[PDB]
# Entry
Amino acid sequence: KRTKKAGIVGKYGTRYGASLRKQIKKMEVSQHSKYFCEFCGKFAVKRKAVGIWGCKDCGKVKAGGAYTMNTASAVTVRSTIRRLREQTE
Amino acid sequence: KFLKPGKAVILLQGRFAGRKAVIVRVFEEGTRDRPYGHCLVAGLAKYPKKVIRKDSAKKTAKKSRVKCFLKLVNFTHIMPTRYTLDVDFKDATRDKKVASCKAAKARLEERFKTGKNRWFFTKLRF
Amino acid sequence: NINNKLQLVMKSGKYTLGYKTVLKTLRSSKGKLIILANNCPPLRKSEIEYYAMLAKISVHHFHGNNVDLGTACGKYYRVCCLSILDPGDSDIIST
Amino acid sequence: GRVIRAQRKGAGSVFKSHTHHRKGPARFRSLDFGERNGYLKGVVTDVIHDPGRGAPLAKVTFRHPFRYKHQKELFVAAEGMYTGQFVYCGRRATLSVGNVLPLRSVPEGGVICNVEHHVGDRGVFARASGDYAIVISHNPDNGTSRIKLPSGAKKIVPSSCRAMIGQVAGGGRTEKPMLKAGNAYHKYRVKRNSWPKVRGVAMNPVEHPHGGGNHQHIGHASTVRRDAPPGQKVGLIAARRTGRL
Amino acid sequence: VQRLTYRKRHSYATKSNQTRVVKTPGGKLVYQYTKKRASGPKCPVTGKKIQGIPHLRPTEYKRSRLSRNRRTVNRPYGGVLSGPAVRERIIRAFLVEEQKIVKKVL
Amino acid sequence: PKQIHEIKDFLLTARRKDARSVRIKRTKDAVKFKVRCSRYLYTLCVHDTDKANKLKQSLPPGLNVQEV
Amino acid sequence: NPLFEKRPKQFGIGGALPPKKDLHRFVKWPK
RNA sequence: UCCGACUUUGUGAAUACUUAUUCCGUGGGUCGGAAGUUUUGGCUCCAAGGCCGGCCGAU
RNA sequence: CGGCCUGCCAACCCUGGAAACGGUUCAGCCGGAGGUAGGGUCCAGUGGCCGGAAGAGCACCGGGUGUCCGGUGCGCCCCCGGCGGCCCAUGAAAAUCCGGAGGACCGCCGUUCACGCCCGGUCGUACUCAUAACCGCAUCAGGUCUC
RNA sequence: CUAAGGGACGGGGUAACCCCGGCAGAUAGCGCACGCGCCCCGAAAGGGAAUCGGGUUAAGAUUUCCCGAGCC
Ligand SMILES: [K+]
Ligand SMILES: [K+]
Ligand SMILES: [K+]
Ligand SMILES: [K+]
Ligand SMILES: [K+]
Ligand SMILES: [K+]
Ligand SMILES: [K+]
Ligand SMILES: [K+]
Ligand SMILES: [Mg+2]
Ligand SMILES: [Mg+2]
Ligand SMILES: [Mg+2]
Ligand SMILES: [Mg+2]
Ligand SMILES: [Mg+2]
Ligand SMILES: [Mg+2]
Ligand SMILES: [Mg+2]
Ligand SMILES: [Mg+2]
Ligand SMILES: [Mg+2]
Ligand SMILES: [Mg+2]
Ligand SMILES: [Mg+2]
Ligand SMILES: [Mg+2]
Ligand SMILES: [Mg+2]
# Structure
């Protein structure tokens, strides 16, 4: 409805090229999404600025990715740091 | 079962927030005026001050003084501790209330001089 | 096997859900067991364990989230803590 | 001719950095006895935005080691840090993301950021958003450590140098297309007077070595000696190769 | 319709030059200069408003200009921390202190 | 300016040393007694005709009295 | 007197604030 | 601007040293040798105590 | 300007314990981390009444009369409140003022209370602000920041 | 009062005029002997002690004079 494929990117009209609009689409969606708060258990985490993710209700503010709360390498880094910490013992 | 007369509590709200008190009477079910469970407590409005050997005799007598308050507190405004202070209290007007406060002050000042219950007279830091 | 036993307590026993009613049952010593979610606020968690130590009530730390609790109890809202006051035909207490 | 634009930036007149709304230098706390021998706990109070910096900064409060005072710090925030979190700095700090450790305490393969080059530098390496260094190896004889920098270069650092555990927050920032001259205008408005660049071929010969001609063309090789004087050193400087491989 | 003029030599509509229209007993309209809207006291741990204190310009809170009951709240950390913040600190102070004793025994 | 409600408090204020004059203003409803003190002008409204007269006669003899 | 008691302070890295020490050898003297 | 000589420029072993020089850090706040605090977004200062102004507590 | 009342929209408190889920905005959104409901606290106003103050001002009649009662709104201007959106943009500082933690020290001495007494320097201030008071050699169809 | 910024003690450079402010130099002092110790200029649109109504001149006062009423 209202659009067959543009979605959030229809605000850009006919400008900038179809491939660039398709490129920006995933980050426009992800940066405006609501994320799960591990501290309180609600989907209330919103981007306050690039890298800054604040929960609406519990008030926790977390440092994360530019356009998504958790980057892929952040999970990988945490697992590497956790394995190094345990094997250190 | 741990909210009984003689048990020590901490007030969490109000004018005496953060003060230590002892339970005197428990209305577990609550009266008609107060449907909720509540207790009568006797607390320290002014803690006895730090008493040290270097002090003179008159000064350490002034530092050992306490002030006592009487208050009815909702159960939800109380942090129940594991400590116990028994001084045989067994307890309306603005004259009866203040007189009863002075009696508890004499008993609590005497307990403090005994040296026991050091936690009860040593304030809380927050 | 704790999700099934908790599922049976909601079907036949008596319980209460939520912080304020968990504290009330501890004050009146009606709860037989306290269950805490793993993301329950650390100040809140400490106070409930201290209340349970004042009485003689056991506390179990639920293996999952506060979203997972409540779902285990078959409700569509989150549950931070649970208090069991009657299991009836459930062996949750003896474990 | 006249002084070219590349030369005029060193005077720093209109080319000074825009820093009026910046929150202060981001760096470790000064190295002291407690960090050198044990650990010190601070609490994260805010995660804030710094204009011109992609990565968020973390406000941390410590207790002063010997004065009855608060000690407030501000460094680059590692990804995953949050407000109300306890961070620990020092030799005996646990290997956890957000903690500040000497490199001697980080095993091989650890991901680190804001790495000191000299002991007490307060952090020199891997500070931009999404960047990190990797611990490669340890030398106990010389007391040095080998780390891998974001550019790929290996570097030898003293094992007493401090680094934070984790990678810098805000990664993925440059994958998003800017799409607009105006978005680029706002980016550089809070950084420097550099954004709208005029091509040297679009100039007159008085202003640029590339200027002039009846067609826009350089007219000589754009690769230039490393030792060329300022005003002459434009184009690709000391290039070992050109073109797209 | 009785258009108005500024009454001082400030000629620019800045936030410090905000006016209101009043009717005088002389039957005319004049400008009166108002005070900028001010936040009241705020709690540093919750960010919420501090109950019991009015929202004034900082110099209107001066002791010679404001009564003492209006300036304060009768509780520890009265005008600084809210009630929820004070309750949490009392509970945290006591519960962590008990843990220190338990660490010592164990 | 401040209002006084009970008659006796107006009596003590008119007896103050810093009180200078009393103005009596007649309205179609009541009678206003205004005593000019150092900082404030105090007004008392008397809705009764005889109470106004009793107040008039009982004023301190040292204070000036004016009819408005 | 039972009121008198010891109140020791443990001077660790993150312990009680230390008392005044000599600090003479670490003084930054005039040029 | 690169490059060489002299000067700054010293000492000792068959390359080492540190005090010149250079760089970095700190409110110059635990350096050298020996002897013998992970806790929950809370508070932490101006010593209690012991023994003769003095010493330990605080090698 | 002072006193009393009122108490928006948010925020907070106490009781209680919600699925047959409910409450709710133009939009949102909110609730076992405690909703709906019931009862309260605070907040701001350029809100109401009284004092100021009808003695003033205004309009009439020759000293006198009057200065009263309602209704309405996607109306216009200013201010405030509370939501939503946006940023690889996150949008001053300091003086100044208030509050708080602690409790060394102190008794006929403390008092941020009311009322009472005295004092308040220097310089600017007229007028124009424009198709004639400014610049454009001018009393120039130009140019010159605002309510 | 501070903003962007400007000047400037010591020190450094410079034949001198003059050019350099973070390069740290016993920082030139503050409370009650004892204790502590990390320059100025720059906004009549930024921040900011405290005023209102009515009257008055040929010419002032869009809050300065008069009347009354307040405030700092
Ligand atoms: K030239
Ligand atoms: K430009
Ligand atoms: K270009
Ligand atoms: K050319
Ligand atoms: K108040
Ligand atoms: K004038
Ligand atoms: K003209
Ligand atoms: K000004
Ligand atoms: Mg051309
Ligand atoms: Mg040329
Ligand atoms: Mg209600
Ligand atoms: Mg009136
Ligand atoms: Mg009239
Ligand atoms: Mg307009
Ligand atoms: Mg106090
Ligand atoms: Mg100044
Ligand atoms: Mg400046
Ligand atoms: Mg000089
Ligand atoms: Mg100035
Ligand atoms: Mg101004
Ligand atoms: Mg005039």
About this structure: Residues 83-105 of chain E form the longest helix (23 residues).
